[PDB]
Amino acid sequence: SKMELPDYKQWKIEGTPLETVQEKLAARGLRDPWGRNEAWRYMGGFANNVSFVGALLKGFKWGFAAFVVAVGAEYYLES
Amino acid sequence: GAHLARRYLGDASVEPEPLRMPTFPPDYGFPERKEREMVATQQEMNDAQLVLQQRDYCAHYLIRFLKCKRDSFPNFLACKHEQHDWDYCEHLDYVKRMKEFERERRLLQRKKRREQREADMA
Amino acid sequence: SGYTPDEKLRLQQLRELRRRWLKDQELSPREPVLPPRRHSIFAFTHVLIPVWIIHYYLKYHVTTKPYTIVEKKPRIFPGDTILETGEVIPPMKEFPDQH
Amino acid sequence: SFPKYEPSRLASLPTTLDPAEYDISSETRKAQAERLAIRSRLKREYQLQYNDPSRRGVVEDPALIRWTCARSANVYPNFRPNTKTSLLGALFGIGPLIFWYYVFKTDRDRKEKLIQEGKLDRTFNISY
Amino acid sequence: ITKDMLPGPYPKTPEERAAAAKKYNMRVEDYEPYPDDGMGYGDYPKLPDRSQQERDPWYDWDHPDLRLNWGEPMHWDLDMYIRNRVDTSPTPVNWNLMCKHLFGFVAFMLFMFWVGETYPTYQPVGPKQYPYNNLYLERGGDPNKEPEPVVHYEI
Amino acid sequence: AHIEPRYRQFPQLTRSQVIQAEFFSATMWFWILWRFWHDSDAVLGHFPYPDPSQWTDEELGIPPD
Amino acid sequence: MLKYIIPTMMLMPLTWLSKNSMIWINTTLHSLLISLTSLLLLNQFGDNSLNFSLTFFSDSLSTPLLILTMWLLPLMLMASQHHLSKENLARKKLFISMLILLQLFLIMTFTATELIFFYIMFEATLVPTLIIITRWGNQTERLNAGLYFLFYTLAGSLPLLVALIYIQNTMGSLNFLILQYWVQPMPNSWSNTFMWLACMMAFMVKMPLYGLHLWLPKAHVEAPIAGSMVLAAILLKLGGYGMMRITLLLNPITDFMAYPFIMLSLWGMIMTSSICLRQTDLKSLIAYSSVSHMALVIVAILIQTPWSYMGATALMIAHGLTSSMLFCLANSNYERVHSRTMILARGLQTLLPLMAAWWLLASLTNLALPPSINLIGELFVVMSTFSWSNITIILMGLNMVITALYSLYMLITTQRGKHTHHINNILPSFTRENALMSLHMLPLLLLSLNPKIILGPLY
Amino acid sequence: AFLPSAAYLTHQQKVLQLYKRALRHLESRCVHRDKYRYFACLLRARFDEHKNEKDMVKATQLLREAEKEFWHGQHPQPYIFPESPGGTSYERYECYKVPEWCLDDWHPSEKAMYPDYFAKREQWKKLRRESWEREVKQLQEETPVGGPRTEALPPARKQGDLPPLWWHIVTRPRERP
Amino acid sequence: DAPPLTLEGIKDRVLYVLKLYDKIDPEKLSVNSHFMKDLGLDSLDQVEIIMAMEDEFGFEIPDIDAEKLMCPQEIVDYIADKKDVYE
Numbered sequence A: 001s002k003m004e005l006p007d008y009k010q011w012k013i014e015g016t017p018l019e020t021v022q023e024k025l026a027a028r029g030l031r032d033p034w035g036r037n038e039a040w041r042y043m044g045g046f047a048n049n050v051s052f053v054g055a056l057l058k059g060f061k062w063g064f065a066a067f068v069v070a071v072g073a074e075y076y077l078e079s
Numbered sequence B: 001g002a003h004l005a006r007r008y009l010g011d012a013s014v015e016p017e018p019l020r021m022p023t024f025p026p027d028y029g030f031p032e033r034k035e036r037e038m039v040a041t042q043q044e045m046n047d048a049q050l051v052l053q054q055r056d057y058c059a060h061y062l063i064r065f066l067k068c069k070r071d072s073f074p075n076f077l078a079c080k081h082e083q084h085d086w087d088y089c090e091h092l093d094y095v096k097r098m099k100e101f102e103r104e105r106r107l108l109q110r111k112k113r114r115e116q117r118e119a120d121m122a
Numbered sequence C: 001s002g003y004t005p006d007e008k009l010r011l012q013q014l015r016e017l018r019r020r021w022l023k024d025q026e027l028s029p030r031e032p033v034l035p036p037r038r039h040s041i042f043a044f045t046h047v048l049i050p051v052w053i054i055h056y057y058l059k060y061h062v063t064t065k066p067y068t069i070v071e072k073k074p075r076i077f078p079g080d081t082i083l084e085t086g087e088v089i090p091p092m093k094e095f096p097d098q099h
Numbered sequence D: 001s002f003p004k005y006e007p008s009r010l011a012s013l014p015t016t017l018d019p020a021e022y023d024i025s026s027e028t029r030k031a032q033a034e035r036l037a038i039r040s041r042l043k044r045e046y047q048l049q050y051n052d053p054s055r056r057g058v059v060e061d062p063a064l065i066r067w068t069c070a071r072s073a074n075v076y077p078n079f080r081p082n083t084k085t086s087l088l089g090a091l092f093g094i095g096p097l098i099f100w101y102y103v104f105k106t107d108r109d110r111k112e113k114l115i116q117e118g119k120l121d122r123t124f125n126i127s128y
Numbered sequence E: 001i002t003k004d005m006l007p008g009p010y011p012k013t014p015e016e017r018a019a020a021a022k023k024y025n026m027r028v029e030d031y032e033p034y035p036d037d038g039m040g041y042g043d044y045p046k047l048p049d050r051s052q053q054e055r056d057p058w059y060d061w062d063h064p065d066l067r068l069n070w071g072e073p074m075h076w077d078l079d080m081y082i083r084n085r086v087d088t089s090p091t092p093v094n095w096n097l098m099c100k101h102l103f104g105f106v107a108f109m110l111f112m113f114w115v116g117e118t119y120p121t122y123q124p125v126g127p128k129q130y131p132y133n134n135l136y137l138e139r140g141g142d143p144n145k146e147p148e149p150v151v152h153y154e155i
Numbered sequence F: 001a002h003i004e005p006r007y008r009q010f011p012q013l014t015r016s017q018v019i020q021a022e023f024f025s026a027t028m029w030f031w032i033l034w035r036f037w038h039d040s041d042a043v044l045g046h047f048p049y050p051d052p053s054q055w056t057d058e059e060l061g062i063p064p065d
Numbered sequence G: 001m002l003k004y005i006i007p008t009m010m011l012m013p014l015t016w017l018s019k020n021s022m023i024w025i026n027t028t029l030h031s032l033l034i035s036l037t038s039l040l041l042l043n044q045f046g047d048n049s050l051n052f053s054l055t056f057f058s059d060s061l062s063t064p065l066l067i068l069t070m071w072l073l074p075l076m077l078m079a080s081q082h083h084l085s086k087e088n089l090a091r092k093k094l095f096i097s098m099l100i101l102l103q104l105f106l107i108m109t110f111t112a113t114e115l116i117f118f119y120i121m122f123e124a125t126l127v128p129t130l131i132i133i134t135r136w137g138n139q140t141e142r143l144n145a146g147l148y149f150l151f152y153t154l155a156g157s158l159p160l161l162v163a164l165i166y167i168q169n170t171m172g173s174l175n176f177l178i179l180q181y182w183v184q185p186m187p188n189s190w191s192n193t194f195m196w197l198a199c200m201m202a203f204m205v206k207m208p209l210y211g212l213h214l215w216l217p218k219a220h221v222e223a224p225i226a227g228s229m230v231l232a233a234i235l236l237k238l239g240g241y242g243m244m245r246i247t248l249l250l251n252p253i254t255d256f257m258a259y260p261f262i263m264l265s266l267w268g269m270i271m272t273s274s275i276c277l278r279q280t281d282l283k284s285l286i287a288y289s290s291v292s293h294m295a296l297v298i299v300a301i302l303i304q305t306p307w308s309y310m311g312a313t314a315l316m317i318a319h320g321l322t323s324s325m326l327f328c329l330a331n332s333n334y335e336r337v338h339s340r341t342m343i344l345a346r347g348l349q350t351l352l353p354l355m356a357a358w359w360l361l362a363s364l365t366n367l368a369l370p371p372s373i374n375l376i377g378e379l380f381v382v383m384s385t386f387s388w389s390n391i392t393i394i395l396m397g398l399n400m401v402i403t404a405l406y407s408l409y410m411l412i413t414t415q416r417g418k419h420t421h422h423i424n425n426i427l428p429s430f431t432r433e434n435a436l437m438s439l440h441m442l443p444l445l446l447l448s449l450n451p452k453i454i455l456g457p458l459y
Numbered sequence H: 001a002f003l004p005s006a007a008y009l010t011h012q013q014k015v016l017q018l019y020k021r022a023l024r025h026l027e028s029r030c031v032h033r034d035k036y037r038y039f040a041c042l043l044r045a046r047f048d049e050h051k052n053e054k055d056m057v058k059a060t061q062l063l064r065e066a067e068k069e070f071w072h073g074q075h076p077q078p079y080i081f082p083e084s085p086g087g088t089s090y091e092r093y094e095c096y097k098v099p100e101w102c103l104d105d106w107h108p109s110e111k112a113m114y115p116d117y118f119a120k121r122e123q124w125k126k127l128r129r130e131s132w133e134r135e136v137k138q139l140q141e142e143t144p145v146g147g148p149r150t151e152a153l154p155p156a157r158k159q160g161d162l163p164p165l166w167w168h169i170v171t172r173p174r175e176r177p
Numbered sequence I: 001d002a003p004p005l006t007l008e009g010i011k012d013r014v015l016y017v018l019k020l021y022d023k024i025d026p027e028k029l030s031v032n033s034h035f036m037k038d039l040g041l042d043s044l045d046q047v048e049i050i051m052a053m054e055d056e057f058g059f060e061i062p063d064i065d066a067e068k069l070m071c072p073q074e075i076v077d078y079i080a081d082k083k084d085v086y087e
Ligand SMILES: *C(=O)CCCCCCCCCCCCC
Pocket: B001, B002, B003, B004, E121, E122
């Protein structure tokens, strides 16, 4: 029913591109008022998402190992 | 696909028209040419229920492949060698068709050269 | 310019009246007072009985009448054997091999 | 610069681009107040007739009956035959009829002439 | 219902227009009747010809589907402008620009298809060589008559 | 039980969906690699296409003129 | 046909002798028994008509119309027994008497051997319908609708009388069998032009032909439910049966005569259908749908091809049943909401699920969903007219859009959307209404299995 | 323009509406969060450039040109929330919002399986039919000459009095039936 | 699927979203704090805060209602009446 929220101290501005946006704004002379609200999206399990080539090559290592094992088995079972 | 460039963007009087081809008699520079031979008898090729588009010169390999497909059930990948043989025969037929195309192109070019000789001689 | 006291009071009054109605939508655990009222059946009462019915209706009511069910003649290859006649097809011509 | 919105019959001008919305004159203020008062009176009448516990039936809407009688039965008592209505009746009432009659007469004459000279393919046409 | 709460003829003088505006519960200035062309509109006012989608949906209406209040004098063609029918909402692009863009696009594609039909593409090979006089017997030709035989040779 | 909701963090994932996704990705890669090692023809090239203009003149029947 | 007339003449004292609470039950029971006995007319042949005596005969054309008529009368008694619950006992018995007399008149008209008997009975059908319309109608201006109906019918039918008496004095008889065996060709003369006009215009009035259809959008609206059903499902088919009988006698002039009239339908059934796109009254929408279907019937009969005849009779029966069901649906909704405005009652599916199912089935049968009878008839008409000419497929095909474009529209606004707030008297579905609509619908779906009995006289 | 309580939109309301719609369209055009945050800060700075103004006419055609620029730079397909009108899930479960008065048409056989709820509904109906008279008495006197000017309704004034015309708002159907 | 929400959780989430704002402080932020009178912010800050809760709770609040959500308890009240809490 009631869900307990975690602590708000953990959502920090650093570790993001949000601080880069903030310092570019400060170079032009503004400030970011919503760093902490958007800081949850880049902190935790969602940090360092894979690129598209990493997405396409998902499960390639075990598939290649099974391919090598199967081709060796069928190469040695012909004799 | 440079034949489209040689036929359309260049001049159209030297490249063959595939709608009407060949325009020359077969017995041009070909002493005792041979005739391509059927292997399947027309009754045997008829009761095998072949589609009229498939009823070309290489129907014998098609009959053999269909028989192998029938007998080797359920192992559908058991005798792909006959399929490869039929594909090779089709490839040879396509090679002969392309050779006919090149012969027609060379004969048209030679006719153009003959009319060029007539223009620059008479 | 926020809520004036009249509309704020009206919205508050309607708020707890709506909440009272919303909690009043809940039922007692006694409700509802409903009035008081073999592993492979699904493969037999749905399949085998229609199979028997359709097989009988096709065998003695459909195929009896002419041209209701038309079967394509099977493929015959050179070298095949026919059960109905017993005459074996002669093999085809000797192959002018290319490869 | 920018591409200015050109309104058409099927593409209305946006409400925030209207100059008349940006007018702060007093006459617009009294017009808005008067239409707000009219709408409030009609709304009050509706929810007075709507929340009655004794009433169990259809709340009569005079505007709906007015619209239906204007659409259905009040079109002929307010009709005057003039040149515009006569021209619109002659263009739309008999024009398509004579056009369709002419094209169908031409097509049927052509078909009958083709059939009676024995050129139309009617070999397998036995259902008519 | 009663007779004087119903539409009548076209008003001409100011006081008949005021009586009509009282009956139609609009202002005397917002009541603009249709012009007397003898079509049968009567004293029905001319609404500004807007769809019901143009009305704000966040307003609380008596009829939420039609976005129309109770007793609000509706348009003469309200059934044309319902939310399941012809709309008049503004578009991000101009209407004439939309029409000329679409017409130019379809005309250009049709012209390209025409010039491609005139100029085909193919593979530089000969025709499909068939046996038995280009398959005369299998094409439905009569076996009693012998047509002109074509013969396909080696190459 | 079911997966309990979480606030601004990664949702809890069991072993079954992870091993299912990994096994299916491995199966897909093994299938494509095995079919590429076995056939290798429909994608890379099946038959040698001969050059049209390189045919010799004596077998195509054009007289020397 | 003296085995059916005498049961109705005995039904007349049966409703003049019952108690004040037992008229409806006794009349319904005995009319359903007569409807059960009505099936004996199906002893037909592919080459001969079933003749009983010198005055009554019935081929494979009039038999489905007879069955529909004396099947519709019990449905009429069910549909009209609630809104007359406040009436006087004498007026209630008079209403049942007019309905019984109308059924007797129709079953005597449909089996008329000779054409003059058919004409006099055809004009005699005017009286109870006019009485019902001008007496038990609800709206104020029902007198105008009754006068328009009576005068359109009479002004059509009096030149028909003159032409029929002229034909009888010329050749010698008006029996349909004799005229089948004593037919004479009519040459292309102006006398034969006016003969064709006099023999046709009555039936073009009662079909109704487009242009002369103005008596339908009034008399179908302000009339009660029984009068609406007898106007929509029988009398138009009475005119169609009369035109089918008459058009045998007018060959070969019609082959160059029916060019305008056919095309007077071939465009009209377009734009009248477009009127259903912009109608605020549901009953007027149903009436204009009937106008479109009868225009299709006009085209099919006037081109006089066999497949057109089969499509005409099939579409006649299917459209009669569908229009009766739609009129009953309109009457039930009008009883519940006390208004004929279509835009008023919305979202009825959330309150009335079974009535929404009946609405869906009626709308689907109205748009010619196969394999119903309406699709069979309209498809046969389209085949026959495409045999007549090519381009006319367009003039049918666009109609194939517009019919759907109103019928499902009639399904949407009355059923789909947010329900009306101030309407809170929507009672649950009465068992009488559900019984009446099932009795309307189930015979159509059952005849979809075996349509060979309603495909005309020449099947 | 068209508001329930006020007869017109002031300059502040127009500016705030333009700001909110501009932020929504900018979030639609700037899908990634950081680009959206940067350009939202830029747009807030642009709005604060002309915040302190003293001429009403200058603010008037500045708002006119700002609205023209916003119309030029709008997203052709703006992001719409699922419950907002125009969304994919807008008024979907409104098809299942059966009104409460249909419960008055139930059979006594199907009314016997929810006894306590129908007893509480009877109590609520009695409360409505005893509150209607004093609520219309309250609304009669409070209404001035010519009817009410605004659509706002007066609240409950006396103790023990329910607000006027409260039934069709308190007993409106739930969002998730 | 679709877990229910309680009013205590509603004000907890609203105070959580408010307490991450950089133009506000987490000390004098309370549930009965007026945004300009008792807290000292701008109208632009008000509409932007309303947009922040509109993004947070996943539905659109209209401007006519948005101008009056002037305290955190009133925002909780509007969310409560919209989402039908305490059922
Ligand atoms: C000459 O070009 C012969 C080849 C066939 C005609 C041209 C086909 C062009 C499109 C397919 C190839 C695309 C290569 C990027």
